[PDB]
Amino acid sequence: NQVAVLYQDVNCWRVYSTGSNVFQTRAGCLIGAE
């Protein structure tokens, strides 16, 4: 039941609720994976 979220075009830091395990890719920013 674990998931992950991808944000389309953000410089991840307009995101509101973020903890650890952040990562920025060419497509966007992804939180929930290492």
Partner: protein
């Protein structure tokens, strides 16, 4: 620029650097092993005889 209204572009799955690798692989096989690598393992053969 300025993204106008709510329209996006999205990126392709395979980047251009990876595509160039695939074409280079085909050149190596046909120069060295002829057409043998299209079916089963590759076998070497001298070019003038090929």
């Amino acid at each position: 620029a300025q993204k106008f209204n709510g329209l996006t572009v999205l990126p392709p799955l395979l980047t251009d650097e990876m595509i160039a690798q695939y074409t280079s692989a085909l050149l190596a096989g046909t120069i060295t092993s002829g057409w043998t690598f299209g079916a089963g393992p590759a076998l070497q053969i001298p070019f003038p005889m090929q």
